[PDB]
Amino acid sequence: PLHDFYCSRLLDLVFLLDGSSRLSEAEFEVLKAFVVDMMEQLRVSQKWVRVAVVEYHDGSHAYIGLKDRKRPSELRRIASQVKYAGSQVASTSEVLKYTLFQIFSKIDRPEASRIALLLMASQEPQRMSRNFVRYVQGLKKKKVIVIPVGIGPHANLKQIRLIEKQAPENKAFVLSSVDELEQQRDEIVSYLCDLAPEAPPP
Amino acid sequence: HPICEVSKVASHLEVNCDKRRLTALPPDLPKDTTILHLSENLLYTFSLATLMPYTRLTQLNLDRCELTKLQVDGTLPVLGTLDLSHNQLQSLPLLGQTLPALTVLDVSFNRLTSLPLGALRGLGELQELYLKGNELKTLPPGLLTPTPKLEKLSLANNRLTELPAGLLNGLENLDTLLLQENSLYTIPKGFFGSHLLPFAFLHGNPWLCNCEILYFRRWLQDNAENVYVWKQVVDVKAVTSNVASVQCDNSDKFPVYKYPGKGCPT
Numbered sequence A: 001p002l003h004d005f006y007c008s009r010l011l012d013l014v015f016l017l018d019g020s021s022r023l024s025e026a027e028f029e030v031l032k033a034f035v036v037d038m039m040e041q042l043r044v045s046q047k048w049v050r051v052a053v054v055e056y057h058d059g060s061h062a063y064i065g066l067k068d069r070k071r072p073s074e075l076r077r078i079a080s081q082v083k084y085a086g087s088q089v090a091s092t093s094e095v096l097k098y099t100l101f102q103i104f105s106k107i108d109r110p111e112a113s114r115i116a117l118l119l120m121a122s123q124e125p126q127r128m129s130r131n132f133v134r135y136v137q138g139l140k141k142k143k144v145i146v147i148p149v150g151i152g153p154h155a156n157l158k159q160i161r162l163i164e165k166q167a168p169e170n171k172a173f174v175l176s177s178v179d180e181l182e183q184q185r186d187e188i189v190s191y192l193c194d195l196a197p198e199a200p201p202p
Numbered sequence B: 001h002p003i004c005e006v007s008k009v010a011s012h013l014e015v016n017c018d019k020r021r022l023t024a025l026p027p028d029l030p031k032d033t034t035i036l037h038l039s040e041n042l043l044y045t046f047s048l049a050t051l052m053p054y055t056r057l058t059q060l061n062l063d064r065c066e067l068t069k070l071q072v073d074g075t076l077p078v079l080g081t082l083d084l085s086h087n088q089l090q091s092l093p094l095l096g097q098t099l100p101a102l103t104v105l106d107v108s109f110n111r112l113t114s115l116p117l118g119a120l121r122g123l124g125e126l127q128e129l130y131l132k133g134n135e136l137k138t139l140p141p142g143l144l145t146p147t148p149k150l151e152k153l154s155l156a157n158n159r160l161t162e163l164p165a166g167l168l169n170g171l172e173n174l175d176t177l178l179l180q181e182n183s184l185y186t187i188p189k190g191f192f193g194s195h196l197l198p199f200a201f202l203h204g205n206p207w208l209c210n211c212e213i214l215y216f217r218r219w220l221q222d223n224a225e226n227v228y229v230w231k232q233v234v235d236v237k238a239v240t241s242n243v244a245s246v247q248c249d250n251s252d253k254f255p256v257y258k259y260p261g262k263g264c265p266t
């Protein structure tokens, strides 16, 4: 497809997909299509621009890692085929914990912007949220920018605001449904473009 | 270069020599090489000293090269990452005097049957050690003594029946410990110390639930949120919190952290 604009950046981008039942299977497909769209706009190639894709419910399910050496079209295919979980619980604390310690532990590429796109449609039980702030602060020290995208009326707004207060760069986006993903995609991608260092078009 | 691809990504000069049916290092590589990929070739043997002309080499990938022996001499002063995974090494090479700046070492999925005494000596900057998928039965004492900065340790899918009591001594920065799928039956008293360990994988072991497991049971009770299950189906890797994954051998999947310990001394 022909998107409204494209940009190549020195960027490490992690997609974190809410795998709760707050999204129907059809709505989850819209979320996945949004992820593929962003990958196309950002000209993802695992060279100058690298991506990871994680679906999270009770735990993290990693479909793509930043160092996976696969051709772009395969990356996009993998992301589009991420399996719908539809679980009762999608723990934001666990997936940020996972991101902090298992994805962004070592800064091999310090010149690159590091971004965790946290796509939220649910609200974990407060029992699991004890170390939530510690993990967001942890990512801050790792120079990882956390971008929470709230989708629907069941998004954990309290945690979204908490993410914003930890660091000025942590910009939040609040959407009424998955239908607004494509409508606000340009704004989200634009923010990434103005944020990250420029890369050569491949 | 006539054989390998040369690419510039940010400040890195990446040289790609992988998947080319090579049986040896191609000569006359660019002297400013910072990353060298030799993955998926037919090397079988390799010598680190042949890379000494490349004084800016920080990453070396020798994975999937059918390596049976790795000759180690000379010095690669700024090498930070070494990938020797998916080869056929039967003995761990001593890399400390040759790779003093090494921070990541991966020798996963080889044929290691043991680790020599002082195996990691000189590797003071080491932060990650992966030895998953070998044939280790026991570990030497003070294995991680010269690596106090260690953050990740993977010993998953070996044949370990015991762990040294002082294995994690001096590791104030350990955040990930993988021990799943071994033959472990007990944890020595004081093994974990007082250090907080965010990720621990302990499932897939025949834990023997008797009076000797009580130290472990207490630790599991105090660290239930830090115990995880590792699972890879097809290409999808899953990491999920589940303290009940640590189960007693010879039972109906009974979780160690609930083991009564009836009749055990107080």
Ligand SMILES: C[As](C)(=O)[O-]
Pocket (backbone or CB within 6 Å): A001, A002, A003, A004, A182
């Ligand atoms: C032109 As479009 C809605 O596919 O980015």
Ligand SMILES: [Ca+2]
Pocket (backbone or CB within 6 Å): A001, A033, A036, A037
């Ligand atoms: Ca599309």
